[PDB]
Design a protein around this ligand. Sequence first.
Ligand SMILES: Nc1ncnc2c1ncn2[C@@H]1O[C@H](COP(=O)(O)OP(=O)(O)O)[C@@H](O)[C@H]1O
Lengths: 425, 419
Amino acid sequence: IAGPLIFVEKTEPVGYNEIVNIKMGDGTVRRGQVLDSSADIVVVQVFEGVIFTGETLKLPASVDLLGRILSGSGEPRDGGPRIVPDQLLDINGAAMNPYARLPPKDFIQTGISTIDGTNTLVRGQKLPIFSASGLPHNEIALQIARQASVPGSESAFAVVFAAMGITNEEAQYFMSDFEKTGALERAVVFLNLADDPAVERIVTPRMALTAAEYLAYEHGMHVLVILTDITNYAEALRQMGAARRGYPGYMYTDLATLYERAGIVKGAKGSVTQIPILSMHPIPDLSGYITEGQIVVARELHRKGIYPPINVLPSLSRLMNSGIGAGKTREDHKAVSDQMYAGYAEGRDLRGLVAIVGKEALSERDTKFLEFADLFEDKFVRQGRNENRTIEDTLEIGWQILTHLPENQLGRIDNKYIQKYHPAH
Amino acid sequence: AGPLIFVEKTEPVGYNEIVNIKMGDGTVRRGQVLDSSADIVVVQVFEGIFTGETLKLPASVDLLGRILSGSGEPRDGGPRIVPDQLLDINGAAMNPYARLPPKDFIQTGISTIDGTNTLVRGQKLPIFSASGLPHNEIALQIARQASVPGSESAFAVVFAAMGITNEEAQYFMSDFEKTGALERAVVFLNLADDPAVERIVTPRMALTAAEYLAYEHGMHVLVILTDITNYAEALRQMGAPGYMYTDLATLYERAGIVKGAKGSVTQIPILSMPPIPDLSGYITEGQIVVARELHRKGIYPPINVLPSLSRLMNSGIGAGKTREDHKAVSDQMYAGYAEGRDLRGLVAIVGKEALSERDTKFLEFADLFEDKFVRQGRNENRTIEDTLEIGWQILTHLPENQLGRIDNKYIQKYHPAHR
Ligand SMILES: Nc1ncnc2c1ncn2[C@@H]1O[C@H](COP(=O)(O)OP(=O)(O)O)[C@@H](O)[C@H]1O
């Protein structure tokens, strides 16, 4: 009803509104009120002495997590045996602070040009996929899961895919796609089904993040966290206890408990990077999750039959400068990125000019820019479902379609880079 | 086939109807009838009987101070059209755009805009919101407050509203009337019922009028387009080529510095939620986000700066533009606020007193920023100097050696701890 909202391990019968004490991993006890509970997990609303004192819900932490498929509670879903831990970690983020005071940094290679090329994802970043209902955002996100890597990083890489409020059909789809490609081998998957207890859905993200932190910090790994639907999560939030539409007031604080949990870790040798998926009667503000930019799925592109239907003009990466350039990608990266962006906007603008003046009333120059916005979409943006591009290959594509423009018309690439890189030099 | 145009309906006409049209140019083109309305025929022209003239706005400097009606006719009971130009509406009218980049400052008097996501002369900066949020209120404030300090050209506002209620229209009228704002503005109002072909011509009527004033009169013109979503809704309610994605393009292409460089057309389109559409095409030079979270907190104007962005900001700010420290103060507030909002997550999870002293001063700053920089009176017009001074004000609350983003030159000079 008012939050903050922590997750306790239903160990003995609780009642609604019960005042309970929660004993943190720290050794300190926080007072709170029972909000709601499933059958194994209790949801408490904290405040800040012979009453119930409960244990904080914990993740069976282990390297053995990799290659396993679990439910929202982190209970085995693959037929495998239960998870033998060596670390029971407080799921609420409140036991370890793995996060260092360091800006997010190096390159993560998604294999997707409209990401790696112009909206580069950086290690320790939060970069959501802004989509809507009916677009292949899940297809994107699991392509990203099959393909992401950290070129030349001596820290190993892992992915934590978490899917919430999903159907049995699409459950079966992820499980098969993760196993038969091999992407599962380096991944811990948490699948919450639209069916499973509302509550279990809500811990799903805190389970996923907690895990990510374990691999990042205590095993020196780069972990990419992918969360299929933050709107599905919000919905679950608006159906807790007392709740006549709209969303709780503590939603905003709550989401912040999710998006505070990312970055480079103490010791610099690992990191947590987030790619939340934001889809779209109810009108959820998930604004706070968008502080480093966002990647944008455009129905327009979807309609022309373009996959992935990513629109770079609205897309953004605020930390892209920290992950590109010499010894990270290549020096011409900013240049190519800037020039394509500039050139695609121009050609996109000119599609309007066309339908004002008529096609034949366009200047030679303009027709080249109009033809480029085309080449950009068909050759750059379009990319197979299982087509993993090196940034090298992505930057080359950029250059190949930039050739279509007048060389005197590349005000974003210093002669330094045209001389060295341009396919006619 | 080819481009859409708009013609005066001399008489009734069918469909797929081959017709002759007299452009403002003087050349005659043929096409077909897309949609027979009442006052206006939508034509699909050929190569880039019935005798018709293209619909055109009576372009004249006396458009200023007039409240018109999307169709171009008067709504303020004022006298009729007083032509000086008679210009086509589609965008062909003047070919007035000097292909140059946006370059100077537009002072909206709104700190979350001016200070953090600066609006540059010649920019398209879509304000992005949802229903239930006061975007029209912001749009309306910008209309009366907007100015171009240090510009030796005249400033002018073109406000165009689509698919609005009577009450809204009356509100907008009085507001323009009483606040002395209309004295510098052209206002096109389209009611949510009058019919639809008319909602469509609205923006084109506005932009032609803007292009007229900017190009042919050396003015800097802000075009506030209030609700592209309404526009989109009317666009599907009709016809069966120029098809929304392409059609918006005819809209978002119409901005920039004009030839001569002695003027500009700047455009602020309102984009709301929640049915269709995809109007991302309008987003290329930034966006200003209106957040419901901030609104359910009782803050006006409810702009979240973190997701907001102006891609062209660096061209509007600095030395002879605003002030030298602008970018430093703007970055440090962005970094300080971003940080404080995350620590709200942290506080929830660990507890207020579990939190570091430094982290606490950041958490407290996120509050000062929302309470003092963002919160602003419906009718308070903040100079950029006002905007920057309250910045430095709330900055003081941060431990001086935590201001990474500001070079010592500006700290030693502007920081209040040492005047
Ligand atoms: N932080 C953000 N918050 C909200 N929208 C954003 C943000 N960043 C970019 N956008 C853009 O907002 C658009 C969503 O609106 P869209 O569906 O295109 O139009 P509308 O919602 O008006 O129908 C996306 O195209 C996206 O690029």
